[PDB]
Structure 1
């Protein structure tokens, strides 16, 4: 019905080998080697990001889709990729990250990247039941993908319901992941939330073509329905492909080391 639902149907109908070739074609991918060697060798000093999510956030902060500052609350922090990146920025003074944890959910990693003394991560916290607290910058990177777009719709709306109780607290910088932004219920909800709190949808090139995630960021603007559709166009055009040239590889940036005031 929507262009994103046609992509989802086409995606579900792919073969296992076509799936692999399509999921990384033309996407931007960072180096994870220094992160994976230090992640055994005890090197919490290397400055190598703990996850790919770190490079996804730098992509938006550098293009000023979001400008972290003050107290940052990181819902669904996982290993802490967004938390340790935000701790390097000058405007940021405190980073509080929450994540579910338990079996099958990522546990926060303790690292000594630049500004690590400002990061406090607490695992074992289901965000759907945690009360909101005052903050200046709101992150939320939650959304478990599924072959059913109907499942993703219910998971996306539940997230968008939860984050609004945090946005009513006044933060004006925010970066919230929309797992399934092409379903009609999600589009209507986003227009309502965009009216009340602002922002807009953006697609990060480091995302994989195997999912339609887009981020509701405070520094974006414009028609939400169209921004989703033009992303749905690129993804479908990447499925119809003969010359599979693969991904554009890039280097991550070093987070640094040491304490901040």
Structure 2
């Protein structure tokens, strides 16, 4: 069993009450207060991200794990956190987001953050059946967690099948969620894909400990398997601390306002 695949068994053996304490222990979390007011009051201009995803992407872009440029395609865009953040960035010219939508799946939110005129999101789109289109930057943030690691595995491999046909079109900047990176079939697929399109895996500290998500990003490199194990070790280390402490809070990204040419 991989170290992740021990962390999962452990995770599942936790009481509802220990679960709650653990999921946010020592993680980075952002101050979303003002964002749900804007949300209540429909303030589309306050600069408040529509979701937690904006901060996660910003963590990876600021460290040059991905450098969005040209036309961005955002698969699984949900409310649009990644799309609106990308729209603020200088290299970016056009952002095309796609998301399933429907009941129980997030609908895109219309906002007037900086570069919003550059954003087009289409809900009602199941990306597993959408044909690929040219792009310079590929995002994908899809992966429904699950107590079963085999379910998470099949979900992950299906995503990594779908993404390959987009990467075949040339974008050299990408950022793709890997929900279940500790399963062997997923590690094997990533090495194959890494041989073909490069990049490597990074653990965003804003992720909750209740999931092992990692992001295959074009600006990382190095051994896929060991990067996975290193994060596995962190998550296990946090399950075994005796004094809990809570998350480390930080301010959210301000996405500003206004149109871009």
Q: TM-score, normalised by structure 2?
A: 1.00
Aligned to 1:240: 240
Aligned to 1:116: 116
Instruction: Provide, for residues 130-161 of structure 1, a one-character-per-residue CA deviation record: whole Å limited to 9, x for no partner.
Output: 00000000000000000000000000000000
Distance 1:165 1:152 in 2: 21
* Cα displacement (A) at 1:65: 0.1
8 Å CA contact 2:35, 2:50 repeated in 1:
yes
Instruction: Provide, for residues 71-111 of structure 1, a one-character-per-residue CA deviation record: whole Å limited to 9, x for no partner.
Output: 00000000000000000000000000000000000000000
Instruction: Provide, for residues 226-249 of structure 1, a one-character-per-residue CA deviation record: whole Å limited to 9, x for no partner.
Output: 000000000000000111111100
* Cα displacement (A) at 1:48: 0.1
Aligned to 1:32: 32
Aligned to 1:187: 187
SS across alignment from 1:110: coil
Distance 1:73 1:2 in 2: 33
* Cα displacement (A) at 1:126: 0.1
Instruction: Provide, for residues 4-62 of structure 1, a one-character-per-residue CA deviation record: whole Å limited to 9, x for no partner.
Output: 01000000000000000000000000011111000011100000000000000000000
Distance 1:209 1:259 in 2: 37
8 Å CA contact 2:179, 2:213 repeated in 1:
yes
8 Å CA contact 2:201, 2:214 repeated in 1:
yes
SS across alignment from 2:238: helix
Distance 1:5 1:167 in 2: 28
Alignment RMSD (CA, Å): 0.3
- List runs of 5+ in structure 2 lacking aligned partners: none
Runs of 4+ with deviation above 2 angstroms: none
SS across alignment from 1:121: strand
* Cα displacement (A) at 1:120: 0.1
* Cα displacement (A) at 1:193: 0.1
Distance 2:26 2:84 in 1: 27
Distance 1:239 1:42 in 2: 39
Aligned to 1:66: 66
Instruction: Provide, for residues 179-223 of structure 1, a one-character-per-residue CA deviation record: whole Å limited to 9, x for no partner.
Output: 000000000000000000000000000000000000000000000
- List runs of 5+ in structure 1 lacking aligned partners: none
Aligned to 2:18: 18
Aligned to 1:127: 127
Distance 2:71 2:224 in 1: 28
Distance 2:42 2:103 in 1: 22
Aligned to 2:4: 4
96-105 or 239-248: bigger deviation: 239-248
